[PDB]
Design a protein around this nucleic acid. Structure first.
Lengths: 102, 92, 82, 50, 112, 49, 121, 119
RNA sequence: UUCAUAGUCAGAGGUGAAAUUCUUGGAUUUAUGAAAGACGAACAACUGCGAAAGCAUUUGCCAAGGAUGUUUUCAUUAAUCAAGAACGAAAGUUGGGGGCUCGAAGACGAUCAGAUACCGUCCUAGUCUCAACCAUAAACGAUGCCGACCAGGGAUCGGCGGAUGUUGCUUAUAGGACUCCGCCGGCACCUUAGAGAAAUCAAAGUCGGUUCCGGGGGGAGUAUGGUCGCAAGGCUGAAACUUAA
């Protein structure tokens, strides 16, 4: 209700202690029950997976982008929006993203 | 058609009251959701709307995110295709 | 260096394999006859060729247009892969 | 047309049609004969017209 | 077309000779009886025509392994394989046995 | 594979054939994925990748 | 004259039903059967033959049409943009409507089967 | 010794011509134009200008720093172009090689007559 | 194009001539590097292919269709067809993503008597992608679609029958092509004699099949009603009257 678009309920089950797991992550277009979600650095480049910009190929539309690392994701949130990662290169220094405003 | 001249879908919801530019759009954009849809997993003509952007197949029960009004659309399709192409160039 | 490998990658043997493929590819068009090129793994051309026609002849043209100057520049390339 | 052919290996004689549609197997064992192909089947047996 | 170049999907000519098998086929239609026939080891080929769920594809594949089958993932839930099999077929899982014919299983024993 | 959950109720036990096929197929997926890994590792240890 | 020329190089009666009649029974395929043996012998089948019994033939045109239709229907449930494709699928369905004019007047079973076969194998 | 090196570029637009003498490194030593002197406009579009510019550059380029060998590189056709080169000879610079290397039209494919600017 | 970095000075941009614009807070022009978006130069040809609209990076995948050759099947099975139904550029429309060059309208400068005009700068939807509409274009080959016959001539592509050896590969050898003729389908030009009003066509021929459809111009592809479309509009479709064209 707080934004009028859907979440996908994800479990997430991995261990340790502290271990932390859960929950209702932001939906992308095309996420369905029974699809796999991968969250991290060597996640597959598939819609719905989360990973650092460095790992993403240039020219791929992304959402829930961080301002700052581990803030978990700020830019591209609202319904049908997306940022576009234009540049990287192996960019040690900077990844250039275009937000939906341009 | 049946007993319908112009056409309708929703248009009774307006009645005579309400008005035209907006009526060209709104039949189209509620009714395109209403259109039984074949589930991407199973294929049966099950898919129906749970909420805005939420779609669910009655037979298999697979529930999906999608456009507000529609099960899908051009934009989602394009994004998936680009991602797949990028992964394939990297694999190379 | 490694970026120069990673993008160069492999040998004289892959230049030939690459030449071979562009010659198969070509025909499509009209039928005749001239152009092949292979653009590398980073950013040079391995070579450019004078062809008509065939699988052995253009591996040869590949071998030949990969003579000294072009041959040497993959040999520089390939050494940099290390 | 009609064509009498003899298997070189089999050294046997057989009669096969010209430019056949499928692979021609030696009746003696099953060695290849003429081949269909990518058209115009030709061949690899020898003789003359029957 | 040529070995190294231009379009080609000629493995799909399996469908033409399968339809042609199906004509007088011994066959098996639907999971409950497909399950009876694959557990009787009889089948030599199965077709799975829907984007069948992990659990519900792998069970058919394990029966295929217990039998002596090859698994054709037609998998596109349109099911135009259903044209042959009877087009009321909105979902299709299919086993092939003695059609009174059959190079078709041999034809598709090489992939493309 | 019951999670069971509980009656007297309106409950929803998770489904009997499906949670054995979800374990047996997890195991039927674990045994080839282990065998392929056990093959891939046998082949990589012997010669290539 | 034509036929007589072939008789002298053939075999013709008695031998031929046995030679032909294995291959039909693995499963169907009449033009394939003509392309094996014995060569001379099977050529003069059409110049002197009734022919023998089979399941299929009469079905095969319909069977093959249903067989293509079910895969084409998948690619008419993924992306509409294949505008060339819709009238490939429509052509065979509807050639089937033409075929089941002529191979419906001589015999029973064909009338009954050929409505139903459309979409179900 | 004449290592003799000084790359020269001829930059063509129909309207006007300007030279920049660069080096291998990519910094620009000097450039010279029309309009450093008075005639401007439809006095620019001249080839006379291409000469004057071709020289105004050179006279420096050479006495002080002293380049001699220089590779001539030019871009597609201006009125000034031919005349640009022609003065490089009388430059008392030894022209090393001549390369035309323009930018072709190359699939700058749009309606906005992008294509036309290029030969 | 944008961003960053290098270097650097008094212009640059633009045209008929100029100005708008850009411009010292260091531009532009110049070098290298990154990201994004668009398109496929060179190639691309009297050229090939799809039913048509149309379609051009190479490359990989699924799957279709027309050539041929076979003489296998139906053995003349077939053909066209109002209604029905499908596809149907661009531009418009609508949701959502992207949004670089471009770019209506609009903002302005010059012109000029006026310019809201050509010409210049700037500029948004659009251009584009996925979803979904529309049903129209000088949708043209200005030539409906089916079949038969009736002149040749230069070669173009595909295959096919080769003939013929050689490049050239490879190397038992053979095609990719090449000297080199013939067939089959399309193409187009060059190009005929009886037709066409002639221009021309060699199909627009000589006369047979079949559908649609035509009505002197303007009024008018308009009115009104029905039908489809979100709307734009489309299909459907007259008269009063006016004129000696």
């Amino acid at each position: 209700p707080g934004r009028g678009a859907p979440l996908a309920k994800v479990t997430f089950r991995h261990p340790f202690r502290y271990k932390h797991q859960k929950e209702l992550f932001v939906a992308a277009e095309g996420m369905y029950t029974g699809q796999f979600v991968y969250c991290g650095r060597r996640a597959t480049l598939s819609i719905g997976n989360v990973l650092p910009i460095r790992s993403v190929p240039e020219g791929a539309v992304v959402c829930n982008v961080e301002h700052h690392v581990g803030d978990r994701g700020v830019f591209a949130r609202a319904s049908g929006d997306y940022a576009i990662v234009i540049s990287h290169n192996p960019d040690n220094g900077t990844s250039r993203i275009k937000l939906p405003s341009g | 058609m049946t007993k319908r001249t112009k056409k309708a879908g929703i248009v009774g919801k307006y009645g005579t009251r309400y008005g035209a530019s907006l009526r060209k759009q709104i039949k189209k954009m509620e009714v395109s959701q209403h259109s039984k849809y074949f589930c991407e997993f199973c294929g049966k003509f099950a898919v129906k709307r749970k909420a805005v952007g939420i779609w669910g197949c009655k037979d298999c029960g697979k529930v999906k995110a999608g456009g507000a009004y529609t099960m899908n659309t051009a934009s989602a399709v394009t994004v998936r295709s680009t991602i797949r192409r990028l992964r394939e160039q990297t694999e190379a | 260096m490694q970026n120069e490998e990673g993008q160069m990658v492999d040998l004289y043997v892959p230049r030939k394999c690459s030449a071979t493929n562009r010659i198969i590819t070509a025909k499509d068009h009209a039928s005749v006859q001239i152009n092949i090129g292979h653009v590398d793994e980073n950013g040079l051309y391995d070579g450019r060729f004078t062809t008509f026609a065939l699988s052995g002849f253009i591996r040869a043209q590949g071998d030949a247009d990969s003579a000294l100057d072009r041959l040497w520049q993959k040999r520089k390339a390939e050494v940099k892969q290390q | 047309f009609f064509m009498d052919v003899k298997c070189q290996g089999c050294f046997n004689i057989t009669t096969v049609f010209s430019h056949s549609q499928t692979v021609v197997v030696c009746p003696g064992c099953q060695t290849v004969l003429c081949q269909p192909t990518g058209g115009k089947a030709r061949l690899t047996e020898g003789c003359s017209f029957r | 077309m040529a070995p190294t170049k231009k379009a080609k999907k000629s493995g799909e000519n399996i469908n033409n000779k399968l339809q042609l098998v199906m004509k007088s086929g011994k066959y098996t239609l639907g999971y409950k009886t497909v399950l009876k026939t694959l557990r009787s080891s009889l089948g030599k080929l199965i077709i799975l025509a829907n984007n069948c769920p992990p659990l519900r594809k792998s069970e058919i594949e394990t029966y295929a392994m217990l039998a002596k089958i090859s698994v054709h993932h037609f998998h596109g839930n349109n099911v135009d394989l259903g044209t042959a099999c009877g087009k009321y077929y909105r979902v299709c899982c299919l086993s092939i046995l003695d059609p009174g014919d059959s190079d078709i299983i041999s034809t598709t024993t090489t992939t493309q | 594979k019951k999670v069971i959950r509980k009656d007297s109720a309106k409950k929803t036990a998770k489904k009997s054939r499906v949670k054995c096929f979800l374990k047996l197929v997890n195991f039927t997926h674990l045994m080839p994925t282990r065998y392929t890994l056990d093959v891939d590792l046998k082949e990589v240890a012997a010669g290539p990748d | 004259a034509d036929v007589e020329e072939m008789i002298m190089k053939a075999a013709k009666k008695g031998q031929m039903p046995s030679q032909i009649g294995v291959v039909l029974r693995d499963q169907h395929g009449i033009p394939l059967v003509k392309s094996v043996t014995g060569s001379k012998i099977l050529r003069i089948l059409k110049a002197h033959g009734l022919a023998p019994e089979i399941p299929e033939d009469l079905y095969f045109l319909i069977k093959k049409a249903v067989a293509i239709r079910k895969h084409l229907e998948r690619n008419r449930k993924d992306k509409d943009s294949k505008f060339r494709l819709i009238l490939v699928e429509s052509r065979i369905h509807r050639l089937a409507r033409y075929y089941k004019r002529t191979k419906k007047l001589p015999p029973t079973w064909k009338y009954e089967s050929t409505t139903a076969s459309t979409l179900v194998a | 010794i004449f290592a003799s090196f000084n790359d020269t570029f001829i930059h063509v637009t129909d309207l006007s011509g300007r030279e920049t003498l660069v080096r291998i490194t990519g910094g620009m030593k000097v450039k010279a134009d029309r309009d450093e002197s008075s005639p401007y406009a439809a006095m620019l579009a001249s080839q006379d200008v291409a000469q004057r510019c071709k020289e105004l550059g050179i006279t420096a380029l050479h006495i002080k720093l002293r380049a001699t060998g220089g590779n001539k590189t030019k871009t597609p056709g201006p009125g000034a172009q031919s005349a640009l080169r022609a003065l490089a000879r009388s430059g008392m610079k030894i022209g090393r090689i001549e390369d035309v290397t323009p930018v072709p039209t190359d699939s700058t494919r749009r309606k906005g007559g992008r294509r036309g600017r290029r030969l």
